[PDB]
Design a protein around this nucleic acid. Structure first.
Lengths: 145, 48, 35, 337, 49, 144, 69, 145, 49
RNA sequence: GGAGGUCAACAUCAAGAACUGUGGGCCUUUGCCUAUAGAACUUAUAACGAACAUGGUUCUUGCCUUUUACCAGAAC
């Protein structure tokens, strides 16, 4: 079945929201002070035992924002648990698919030396000629006579 | 300019082409090739 | 041509119809502005 | 297992109709590398090309409406919005350029691929382009602010082809390392792999109804169901490949373009291949230049558009005489795959 | 200048100084112009150094 | 005829392009050698032809522009025409200038028809204070 | 050391990195707005297409018949 | 401008930095993607796996074929599978028309004299003379046949 | 004045704005044979009406 | 309570020549017709500024060995 209506208007919803959170971050990161125009207690810790409130501290707008930000380089472990069985389905073919070796009159990138012959028509004329020269010939000897 | 130039009048236009055509003939396309595009032609008579 | 032969319109194309500026998709202004 | 084979001598599929060649449009100066047709008025192609133009043809008459130039190196791909009046085209100079039709000019440049970009598609309900190419990741571009919101990391190879769909598995992509992933975006990770094909997976398409996706391969053209990432069918195809493209249809025809220059149509349900065609290459061409680099069906389902390495478009028509009269094709002898 | 307008930006409405003078770190007073000229020379200078 | 016009301009494009950094007097000496060949072969005819006079003005300005950028400047006040026109001896380039002139400009529209005859002049090249400069065409006797 | 490449750079290698925050120009806001869709003459001695290719074309042979001359 | 200068004095320059195609570094790119897009096809005509050495060496056949095409050498490789040879001919025709087409376009940029760079001129004389000779030898051969 | 590429005598000069005027057929309509030159048609007319 | 502030926040500022609310009737909430009330600010040699800068992309030119930096017209 292609999948209904009040389904695609769900998946559409939870996606679209998620993107707006992304975009609104990356706008409100950076340094156009005027890109931001384009757009909780939140700790129960332990059991909350001591309650809490989580209060952002207004910067000093001169100092860098993101004191820890930097441009560094990482390599990541590509770590997975599970395997992906790759599950698919030399006599006559190597006739076909044998490829020679390259010997090129121009480049010789290692300096290799090679037997010359790796470095190094059927038709006749058209009687247009035969007729041409013999006609010229005939008129010639006529004339001289 | 238009005045100083050669004016296009059916008669003279067709002298021009006439002559040129005759002389298109006289030489075979084996030796040379004589295209209209290359030629120019000018006429002198009552109008021009 | 005969390469296809009869049903086949063999048509070679250059230049343009629909001169470049022309909108290729119509715009929509629902109201009629007389001003 | 013989069970399986007895069953396949019953159902005896779905008579469909032949096809033939209505029209040939020359006019490009390179190969013709993608075609994409209006989701609305069916008046016009838009045709990628290897001379870096993109010419907009007229469906009915075959005349040339316009040329949109504006790329440096060859254009691999094009897409045309439904909702928006836009046109994203993408080329190999690494650039994904929005267009706007109303004025016929460029508008937004999306940016950040490391290297050439072989495929775009335009998600249906969200306003997002998706793109990918030799970098081996699929970026999801938000459209108005040009940020690449999300990057789907992934395969181990160039990515040939990307498709979008409205519910989950949202984005589906296939790649010369011979898989096809089914992506779950927000999670940000693969929801399923389908590993079967044997070498690069070079084409795909989405059934416009049935909610499944035909995935070609080199020489064997499978289908797959979404949701589960099933198998579903296996189209009877000896080695005719290399398969450049698939196109599904509203009537469950399937198209497949060869590089040997052979059009191969199928039933979708079955696997039965009911017609083959040598595509008369061209006037002065070189026998290698018979091939087929793209396909699509207009919105009616009755007309076929393909480009070909001999610098031309051909449009194929579905011949109505047919029925059974003397219609039938190759006559259904399912074999042991 | 008259053939090509610009047509400004509603919402420009968040000025720099308003945003700035709101914090802990800035303070306000009066002072002779010339003097403030000089303080700006010291400033500009120490920065570039 | 226009063929030989665009040949001339082809040439001067040639001096310009083809000189890596050729110093100065070499450039100028090439200028002379070219131009003199032209004014000398077509003596009379050059009188009539608008676009050729146009090309003269351009080309020559372009050369002087070369020597100029050779330092760094297009500034006109630095290079009064003494600099370019004093003979080699006095330490100038000695280039023979027939750009200057004043160039007959009359009302193109009709001059596509009648041959309306000169009604106006357009200043070819300039100066700051003027003086004037003699031009070759005046020192070469015409063919007739 | 001049070598034909055998590969290309995974975008992923990039993707792991931390950002920078440099601000380009082409990213500054533009087109913030989407758009939605609803006698003598006898004397003389003489008595009475598209080829897919280039170098065999008729144009190209005109061209080379002009310029290279 | 300065905002950047100082985020780079703190956070260091960016490591990835893609770059773009451009005027200068064009051909190398065009080449580079061409080669890659042979290697797909030729990797899929071969029966199975055998790749690396077979591959590289086949590309060497590519270059050699091109620079034959220029010099007008008829280029027959002694023994080698038909289809492969088809592929090479297909592409090299494609690159060919890229070349000739650009030669026309540029020549007709110079004849106007409108901002053609320096070397572009010298080059384009190269591409011309080559093309002119090919026309020559053609014209003779057909004068034989 | 701009848009027509004209110049009021004391006026500011600008660029053509519709630069290609040079295309023209050789066509009899406005020709000389058939026109009367009586008063010249200075610019200011062309900017006035 | 009145006057003020080189004080703050939140709304709104370019269009069928154009705003909003309410009643009644119709289709079936939008919407249509009709009745009624109030309407700051901005507009006709048209507009928030009887003022005047910069940037991006895409084209046409001009400098013209190439990139910044640029020449002067247009569109977005």
């Amino acid at each position: 079945p292609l999948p209904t209506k009040a389904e695609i208007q769900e998946c559409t919803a939870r996606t679209k929201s998620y993107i707006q959170r992304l975009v609104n971050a990356k706008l409100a990161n950076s340094n156009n002070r005027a890109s931001s125009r384009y757009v909780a207690p939140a700790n129960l810790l332990l059991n909350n035992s001591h309650h809490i409130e989580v209060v952002s501290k207004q910067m000093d707008p001169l100092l860098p924002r993101f004191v820890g930000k930097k441009a560094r380089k990482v390599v990541a472990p590509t770590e997975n648990d599970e395997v992906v069985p790759v599950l698919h389905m030399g006599e006559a073919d190597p006739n076909e698919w044998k490829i020679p070796a390259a010997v090129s009159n121009w480049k010789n990138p290692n300096g290799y030396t090679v037997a010359l012959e790796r470095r190094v028509e059927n038709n006749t004329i058209n009687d247009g000629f035969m007729k041409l020269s013999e006609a010229l010939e005939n008129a010639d000897k006529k004339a001289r006579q | 300019p238009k005045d100083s130039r050669m004016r296009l009048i059916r008669q003279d236009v067709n002298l021009g082409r006439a002559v040129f055509w005759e002389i298109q003939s006289r030489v075979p396309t084996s030796l040379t090739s004589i295209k209209w595009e290359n030629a120019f032609v000018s006429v002198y008579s009552k109008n021009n | 041509e005969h390469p296809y032969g009869k049903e086949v319109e063999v048509l070679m194309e250059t230049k343009n119809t629909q001169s470049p500026q022309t909108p290729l998709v119509e715009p929509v202004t629902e109201r009629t502005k007389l001003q | 297992i013989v069970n399986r084979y007895e069953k396949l001598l019953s159902q005896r599929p779905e008579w469909h109709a032949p096809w033939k060649l209505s029209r040939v449009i020359n006019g490009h100066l390179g190969w013709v590398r993608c075609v994409a047709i209006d989701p609305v008025d069916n008046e016009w192609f838009i045709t990628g090309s290897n001379d870096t133009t993109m010419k907009v043809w007229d469906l009915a008459t075959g005349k040339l409406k316009t040329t949109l130039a504006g790329h440096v190196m060859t254009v691999r791909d094009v897409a045309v919005s439904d909702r928006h009046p836009y046109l994203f085209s993408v080329s190999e100079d690494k650039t994904v350029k929005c267009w706007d039709l109303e004025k016929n000019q460029i508008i937004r440049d999306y940016y950040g691929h490391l290297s050439g970009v072989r495929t775009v598609s335009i998600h249906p309900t969200l306003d997002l382009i998706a793109t990918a190419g030799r970098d081996s990741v699929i970026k999801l571009w938000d459209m108005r602010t040009r940020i690449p919101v999300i990057t789907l990391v992934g395969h181990k190879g160039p990515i040939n082809q990307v498709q979008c769909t409205p519910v989950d598995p949202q984005v589906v992509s296939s790649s010369t390392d011979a898989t096809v992933r089914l992506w779950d975006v927000v999670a940000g990770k693969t929801m399923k792999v389908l590993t079967h094909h044997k070498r690069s997976v070079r084409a795909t398409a989405l059934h416009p109804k049935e909610f499944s996706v035909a995935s070609a391969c080199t020489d064997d053209i499978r289908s797959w169901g979404l949701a589960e990432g099933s198998l579903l069918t296996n189209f009877e195809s000896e080695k005719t490949g290399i398969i450049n493209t698939l196109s599904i249809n509203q009537d469950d025809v399937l198209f497949a373009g060869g590089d040997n220059g052979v059009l191969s149509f199928y039933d979708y349900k079955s696997g039965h291949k009911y017609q083959s065609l040598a595509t008369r290459e061209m006037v002065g061409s070189l026998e290698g230049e018979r091939s087929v680099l793209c396909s699509t069906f207009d919105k009616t389902g009755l007309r076929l558009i393909t480009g070909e390495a001999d610098k031309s478009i051909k449009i194929w028509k579905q011949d109505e005489t047919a029925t059974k009269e003397s219609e039938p094709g190759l006559a259904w002898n399912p074999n042991l795959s | 200048n008259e053939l090509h307008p610009t047509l400004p930006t509603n919402h420009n409405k968040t000025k720099l100084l308003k945003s700035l003078k709101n914090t802990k770190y800035f303070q306000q007073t009066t002072i002779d112009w010339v003097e403030a000229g000089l303080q700006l020379c010291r400033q500009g200078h120490n920065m570039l150094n | 005829s226009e063929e030989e016009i665009k040949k001339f301009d082809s040439r001067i494009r040639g001096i310009l392009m083809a000189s890596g950094s050729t110093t100065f007097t070499k450039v100028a000496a090439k200028w002379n050698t070219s131009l003199i060949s032209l004014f000398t072969y077509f003596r009379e005819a050059i009188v009539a032809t608008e676009p050729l006079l146009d090309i003269l003005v351009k080309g020559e300005t372009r050369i002087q522009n070369r020597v100029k950028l050779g330092l760094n400047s297009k500034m006109p006040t630095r290079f009064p025409p003494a600099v370019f026109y004093t003979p080699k001896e006095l330490g100038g380039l000695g280039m023979i200038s027939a750009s200057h002139i004043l160039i007959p400009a009359s009302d193109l529209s009709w001059s596509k028809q009648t041959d309306t005859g000169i009604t106006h002049f357009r200043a070819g090249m300039t100066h700051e204070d003027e003086k004037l400069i003699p031009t070759i065409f005046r020192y070469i006797t015409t063919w007739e | 050391s001049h070598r034909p490449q055998l590969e290309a750079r995974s975008g992923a290698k990039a993707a792991a990195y931390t950002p920078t925050g440099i601000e380009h120009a082409r990213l500054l806001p533009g087109h913030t707005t989407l758009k939605y869709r609803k006698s003598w003459r006898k004397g003389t001695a003489f008595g009475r297409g598209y080829i897919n290719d280039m170098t065999k074309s008729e144009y190209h042979q005109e061209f080379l018949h002009k310029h290279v001359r | 401008y300065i905002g950047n200068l100082i985020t780079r004095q703190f956070e260091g320059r960016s490591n990835e930095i893609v770059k773009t195609t451009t005027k200068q570094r064009l051909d190398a790119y065009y080449d580079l993607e061409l080669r890659n897009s042979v290697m797909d096809d030729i990797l899929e005509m071969m029966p199975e796996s055998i790749r690396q050495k077979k591959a590289r060496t086949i590309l060497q056949h590519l270059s050699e074929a091109w620079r034959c095409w220029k010099a007008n050498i008829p280029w027959d490789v002694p023994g080698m599978p038909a289809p492969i040879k088809k592929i090479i001919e297909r592409y090299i025709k494609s690159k060919a028309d890229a070349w000739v087409s650009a030669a026309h376009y540029n020549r007709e940029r110079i004849k106007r004299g409108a901002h053609v760079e320096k070397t572009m001129v010298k080059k384009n004389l190269g591409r011309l003379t080559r093309l002119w000779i090919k026309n020559e030898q053609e014209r003779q051969r057909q004068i034989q046949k | 004045g701009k848009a027509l590429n004209n110049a009021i005598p004391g006026g500011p000069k600008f660029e053509p704005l519709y630069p290609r005027e040079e295309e023209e057929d050789y066509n009899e309509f406005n020709s000389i044979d058939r026109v009367i030159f009586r008063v010249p048609i200075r610019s200011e007319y062309k900017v006035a009406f």
